[PDB]
């Protein structure tokens, strides 16, 4: 009763803003805020761009990495804090746009930037009790930064889709287990009229983000009788950089381990496709019998954690599809002017 | 609002249809066949969205809606299949130019405002 | 089948008329019609209009019973007829098959437009483009003729400096024309140094919002002996009409309106004349390129060489042996009220073939008597073709 | 072998009838009442909103499975009306159930199928041997545009349902489930907005009924049945109009669908309608009644369920509030008051 | 020298008793209308705004002038409610009364003392000969915040004067006018805000009070005038409190200051106020009656006046309706009614 | 009988070229300076507003009135951004030159014409007597639609003018004055909505120019005069080209229009774009120059005036900044800091 990932997929915008752009305006020293996040540049979405269309992005690159009929999919789950409705589901135009329509069922996902792994559980429950035969979670952002706040040095655009399978032969890669840590923390929220979100500031790191990652990797190891040792490959949530490699040493893992799920410093913070972007990486340039611990964190709070195996079939499927890296790398600078008018930050 | 759901399909997916008589592709799909009218028998057919630049256009002066594109390149495309379509181009001004090579792209085109339904579709991106 | 005439032309300035209305405007081309023709009112039988600017601009559709009503013509049936741009000669020809039938002798054919009321014109001139194909995409009705003239300048070599005098000489034109929207002289420069609107097009390559009204009494040839002086008749020879793509991008060859051909060629023969005799054309060019090819598909020259007989002006008024191109100044200088715009152009024509005083200054020399239009509706989806003559 | 352990409902006391809505907008109440099926609507008090509800649900499904709640590993909470619009209502519930920390969440969105998602997604966990428990609420404060018909149907409520994979503790069975979703613009809305809008006549045929009949047809062929295998059925109901025409259609007498249609005096709860019903469906029935459940959601979807009622649901109707009981203590208000306590009134 | 050729005044049908809004919020009404000294308040047709409201007055007061509105050099709408942010009510009265298009306009802000602001404007402009007729008009449509006080008093309302030169043509001369003006944060309200804030308690004493005092005591030293040399009187009445309190400091009796106080029957229709009280007043008032009228508006400032009725004035009160028939002529409305007029409720 | 006493002016000191709002939107900067003859426009600081701009005026023309401040017996204030909503702009005013408290105020909305609508006022109460000085002012910091063509010209200044009585103290003197005025919907901004919407080609032919040249003509009729007797003039500036044809049309040559024409430098400041223009030529005009000005605002309307100096003019132009002076100081800016600085970006 094996799952595992059959196929995976990644989009990220071709525009980029670095943090010059956005200090210049601000008055605020670069340096100071690229050492202090570890953070060089973010993502930019076309105005012609959105959750939807990022979601259908990765959605189409992971149905050529498993090189299935769309049909067969049996649940869409979009997880996202940008979702283009507030009441219209974003998974319903993901389905209709690769073909998976009508035998599915779909949800949108909110959880803050956990949404996108907490569909990825879900695939896997339908998955493995036998109710559908194939499942997509994607994870998927167009974060918006307040303008005069820290956030928006990080705040980008991207995503990831995963479909799960049961089939040995068409697995890249396979779930040893899945274990959750949630609470009820008020780190970060938004309130439904507010254009952007308020936080507590410093609360936001320990008592919130260390306290759900760290309990959540712990606790998978604990349920996986598993060392730091035992795995190749780690990626954590990044808002930024700082963060992820604060829990990355906090554990014990090295450079060769942590390094290639840290996108945030020239990607910025995709929030729920940020986990799922970084993941994907590692499967780009991961070898069979490659061990990853994945675990995400969400504002709320609430973290996911995994334990996957790389199998033999990765080689395969790599090329299918463009690589994060790839696409990372093909960019287009915006100043800080061009920036605000695409995110739609001028009042008009 | 209902107009948009019946062609979603062919805006999403670039599915036409193809008439057995003569084979001719038609997109955006059609009901009766123009050449054999009622003789004409037409299947559904799916388009790979891959086609080049026929001619195009640089829109200096759009409706407020496209001020963030503003200056955006329109163009029709000729599709692989046969068919030809009506879209823009997400490229640089400078490097339009007739029989380059585009494949589509799923993006968002239009919105009814701020209350209404967002309109997604085709876009068209070069090949390099 | 009987033959129709015309026995009366009237018509409004072209232009952003600020202190006239809607009424004002319809009234004003009505009367001058009226009394071009020596008719009373109680003499039309019918009316047929064309109007855009009503549903698009004001909500208001049953403009016939309208301007009936304002008229002061009720209970004469009035109806309204659309083909976008092409609603004016559509609303002709529709009033020429009237008479021909027989249930109507008098018969006022007229158009107009108040587009100045709205706020945003584009929205309503982008109605004649397949609003699910072509505008929702963002293809605005200058980028589809935009894109016209790319695809003419790949095939067949058309240089802008080329396009561009097809702009010069429309507004030299203009400057003899009193209704003339614009009367300014300008320069192959100062067109290409425009503002641009749709490369490879500018601002003075494409004609302007106007607001604007004209009619014409149109007559049983023999009836319109009644009214008018045998010599002061001018003859409908053909009325033909032709359907194409709605959109741009279905059209067989994109640098031809086949609709055009279709028409131009039917009414040729049905006058049997051949395209060497007509004295005079006007041809629908809301944006130069569209002056180009109309020359082209009505046998003027040959396919790729409109260009060549513009950069050497022998569409001018003053270059003999050659067919005379809207002498009034075409949609672009003249103006182009898009409901009145088909009955302009023939009332311009019977000025000319009748030597009427309100052309003197830009009158055209005519051989042999005959005169064609060509009206396009949005892209080439429609076209109509009127011939006159002054022999019946 | 997946069943529901236990199942708990919540409705406040308050509620408004058309009368008093009709009364302030100058229409016919009556008219209404007959063209909706619709005689009063629900109300939550103004210290009530979607999670104060789920957590009366959850709380009540707790005492009917009469497990502990630690033992709940997924909380998913399927709504309109999240209080926040980032921050999580499925973490809050598990909070005031005790079942954190070890556990997984995610708040649901589809319109008003968002609540049968979530037990759907606990299926898949409790058969994959992946948790032992999960919960799936639904539950919404639902609000109408003042003057629009939507303001006489608009109401709150909530049930939730804990999953389990115990033959003994199950008080009913899914025998299947499956789930019919296009892409339809009937109904939506827009982030800065404060009320949705909708296409009007287009809600009904090709979006309400096109889905539910495709799910109900589909579940149906899926497991091999017709209508008279189904003791009861309960439809997704956003007025009782909509809901007797479906049921009618695929040719359920009022016996079978009466007991799953509450909206002619709870009002349409959304993505706590149809759990809501089918709790009322759980109060009422006995071993070995077979039920039919689909939901809708704008959007567009549904999900189907095929369940079966067990002995052991006489154990436990009792260890908490019935469904009709909760709808039927109820204080009347008037418009002035109802609009003071949604948040109406401009301030 | 100057003087008042013709005034009138307008008030809508629906009223809103105390009781019907504090039964809604959960208030005694006996305690509010004893606190404000407030019974009911007008309010406006949903039809109806400033702009209709200062027509309605400024047509009434043409027809007691009975002059030929082409003559009007100047109209002044002074308000806090002008339909527009940016487009002048008084162009589309001065349109409305065939005052166009040889006269200048403006809309004023000033609090509720706008209104009598224009009056000092157009004496100025008769006075120094360079118009022959001046119209200043007050009007306002209220909106009190729902559940704060000043909804019990918020109120719709205005009067308009035509300002002239010549004495047959004149109902009554001004004496002298003077004004007292600080910068005060009693009340205030943002750009992007649907109802004002305030100092709650600072209103009181340190402003109103302050100012409309100083402004009285001003404009008596100035005219070498005491309390007994007046018959009638009028202040600013946001409450009846505040008015009755002012008079009897001043040493106004009950029948000096009865006729301008009509806040307790139709609200406080701020920059209406004090110009609808003057109508009243000059509705009774005999030839040779002495007048005092002092404004007050948040700002802070006063507009202190000096009036004596000549023999004209029964000429041309029934040339137009009087306020006290505008004010009694009413339908009564609930809070559900009341808020749905007003465009309280959010959509 | 009635003048200028004393005049003063203000402009911000940042600038914005054409080119960075060109740059950003897509547009051609040449067409668009071409087009609008407009190279940039004025920004004012985020610690800058109408009242602070509006303060620099007024203490300006204080100096050059060499007065005391305690004289001015009005104090009024045109804008069309005035701080608060509900809130004299004119009292801070008064407040901040020490002219309160024996003063009368008003802020004046009228779009662009309120500021010389105050002058009037001013003239009025100074000619009756009723007042020694007045003071009037038109101040604006403009904020244009992004992406809007309005964005290129809406800019931030203000002027003041002290008007007085006595010969030996007035710079210059009204020789006359008239307006014209209508109602036209050609520019608005409804109380919701952050920026105007307009009538676009309506703007011109049938409302700016209809009421500027009218009451150009009317003034002109009234005064006995031809434009030969001028020799300056300064129109409403909503761009260099609307001035330019309206200043030919009647028939000045550019020696005439050239002072008071600043919009290619400093954008439209609307209510203070005639009052900085007439400022410009009194810092350059002699003794007995004649001076035709002309505002207009949108609604609609047009104040014109006639103008002569006097022999104290070059007392006085020293004894405070030059218009000149202040649009020459100027720090230039990108559009990023630009809508930082005006606050367009959504927070
Ligand atoms: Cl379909
Ligand atoms: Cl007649
Ligand atoms: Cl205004
Ligand atoms: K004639
Ligand atoms: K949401
Ligand atoms: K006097
Ligand atoms: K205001
Ligand atoms: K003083
Ligand atoms: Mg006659
Ligand atoms: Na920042
Ligand atoms: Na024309
Ligand atoms: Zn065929």
Redesign the interface.
């Given at each position: 009763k094996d799952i595992g990932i059959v196929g995976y997929g990644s989009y990220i915008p071709k525009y980029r803003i670095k943090v010059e752009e956005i200090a210049k305006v601000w008055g605020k020293d670069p340096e100071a805020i690229k050492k202090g996040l570890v953070v060089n540049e973010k993502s930019v979405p076309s105005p012609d761009e959105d959750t939807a269309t990022i979601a259908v992005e990765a959605a189409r690159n992971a149905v050529k990495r498993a090189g299935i009929n769309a049909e067969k999919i049996g649940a869409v789950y979009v997880g996202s804090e940008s979702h283009p409705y507030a009441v219209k589901p974003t998974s319903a135009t993901v389905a209709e746009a690769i073909g998976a329509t009508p035998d599915l069922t779909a949800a949108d996902l909110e959880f803050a930037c956990k949404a996108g792994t907490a569909g990825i559980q879900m695939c896997m429950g339908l998955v493995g009790s036998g109710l559908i035969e194939y499942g997509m979670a994607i994870g998927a952002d167009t974060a918006q930064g307040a303008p005069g706040d820290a956030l928006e040095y990080t705040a980008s655009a991207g995503g990831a889709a995963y479909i799960i399978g049961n089939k040995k032969d068409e697995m890249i890669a396979v779930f040893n287990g899945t274990y959750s840590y949630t609470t009820d923390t008020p780190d970060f929220w938004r309130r439904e009229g507010q254009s952007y979100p308020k936080h507590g500031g410093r609360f936001t790191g320990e008592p919130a983000y260390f306290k759900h990652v760290l309990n959540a990797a712990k606790g998978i190891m604990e349920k996986m009788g598993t060392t730091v040792k035992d795995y190749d490959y780690c990626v954590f949530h990044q808002p930024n950089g700082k963060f992820y490699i604060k829990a990355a040493k906090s554990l014990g893992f090295t450079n060769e381990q942590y390094k290639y799920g840290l996108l945030t410093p020239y990607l910025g913070n995709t929030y729920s496709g940020a986990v799922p972007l970084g993941l994907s990486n590692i499967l780009d340039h991961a070898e069979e019998g490659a061990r990853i611990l994945a675990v995400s964190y969400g504002s709320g709070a609430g973290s996911d954690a995994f334990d996957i195996t790389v199998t033999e079939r990765i080689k395969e499927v790599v090329d299918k599809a463009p690589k994060t890296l790839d696409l990372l790398n093909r960019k287009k600078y915006i100043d800080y002017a061009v920036y605000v008018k695409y995110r739609g930050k001028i009042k008009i | 609002?209902?107009?948009?759901?019946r062609?979603?399909?062919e805006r999403?997916?670039l599915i036409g249809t193809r008439c057995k008589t003569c084979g001719k592709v038609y997109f955006?799909s059609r009901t009766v066949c123009p050449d054999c009218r009622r003789k004409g028998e037409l299947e559904e057919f799916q388009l790979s969205g891959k086609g080049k630049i026929?001619?195009?256009?640089?829109?200096?002066?759009?409706?407020?809606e496209?001020?963030?594109?503003?200056?955006?390149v329109?163009?029709?495309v000729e599709l692989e299949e046969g068919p030809?379509?009506?879209?823009?181009v997400?490229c640089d001004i400078n490097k339009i130019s007739?029989g380059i090579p585009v494949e589509a792209?799923?993006?968002?085109?239009?919105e009814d405002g701020?209350?209404?339904?967002?309109?997604?579709?085709?876009?068209f991106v070069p090949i390099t | 089948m009987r033959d129709v005439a015309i026995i009366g032309y009237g018509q409004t300035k072209f232009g952003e008329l600020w202190e006239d209305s809607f009424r004002d405007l319809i009234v004003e081309a009505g009367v001058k019609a009226i009394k071009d023709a020596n008719v009373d009112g109680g003499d039309i039988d019918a009316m047929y209009i064309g109007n855009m600017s009503g549903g698009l601009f004001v909500g208001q559709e049953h403009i016939a019973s309208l301007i009936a009503d304002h008229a002061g013509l009720n209970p004469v049936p009035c109806t309204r007829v659309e083909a976008a741009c092409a609603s004016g000669s559509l609303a002709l020809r529709s009033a020429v098959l009237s008479v021909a039938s027989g249930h109507h002798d008098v018969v006022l054919a007229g158009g107009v437009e108040k587009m100045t009321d709205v706020e945003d014109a584009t929205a309503a001139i982008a109605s004649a483009s397949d609003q699910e194909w072509e505008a929702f995409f963002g293809a605005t009705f200058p980028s589809l003729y935009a894109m016209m003239a790319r695809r003419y300048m790949y095939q067949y070599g058309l240089t802008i400096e080329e396009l561009s005098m097809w702009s010069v000489i429309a507004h030299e034109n203009a400057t003899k024309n009193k209704y003339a929207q614009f009367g300014f002289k300008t320069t192959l420069e100062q067109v290409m140094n425009a503002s641009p609107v749709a490369d490879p097009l500018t601002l003075m390559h494409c004609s302007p919002v106007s607001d604007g009204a004209s009619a014409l009494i149109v007559c049983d040839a023999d009836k319109a002996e009644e009214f008018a002086p045998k010599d002061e008749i001018i003859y409908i020879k053909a009325s033909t009409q032709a359907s194409d793509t709605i959109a741009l991008h279905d059209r067989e060859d994109m640098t031809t309106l086949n609709a055009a051909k279709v028409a131009s060629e039917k009414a040729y023969k049905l006058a049997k004349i051949a395209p060497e005799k007509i004295d005079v054309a006007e041809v629908h060019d809301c944006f130069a390129i569209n002056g180009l090819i109309l020359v082209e598909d009505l046998g003027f020259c040959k396919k790729g060489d409109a260009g060549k007989v513009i950069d050497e002006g022998k569409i001018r008024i003053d270059y003999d042996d050659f067919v005379t191109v809207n002498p009034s100044g075409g949609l672009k200088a003249a103006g182009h009220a898009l409901g009145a715009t088909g009955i302009r152009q023939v009332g311009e024509l019977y000025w000319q073939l009748k030597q009427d005083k309100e052309c003197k200054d830009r009158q055209a020399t005519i051989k042999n008597g005959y005169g064609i239009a060509a009206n396009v509706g949005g892209t080439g989806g429609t076209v109509c073709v009127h011939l006159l003559s002054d022999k019946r």
């Open positions: - | 609002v209902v107009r948009s759901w062609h979603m399909k999403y997916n955006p026929y001619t195009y256009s640089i829109v200096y002066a759009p409706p407020k496209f001020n963030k594109l503003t200056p955006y329109i163009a029709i030809k379509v009506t879209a823009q997400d007739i792209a799923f993006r968002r085109i239009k701020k209350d209404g339904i967002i309109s997604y579709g085709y876009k | -």
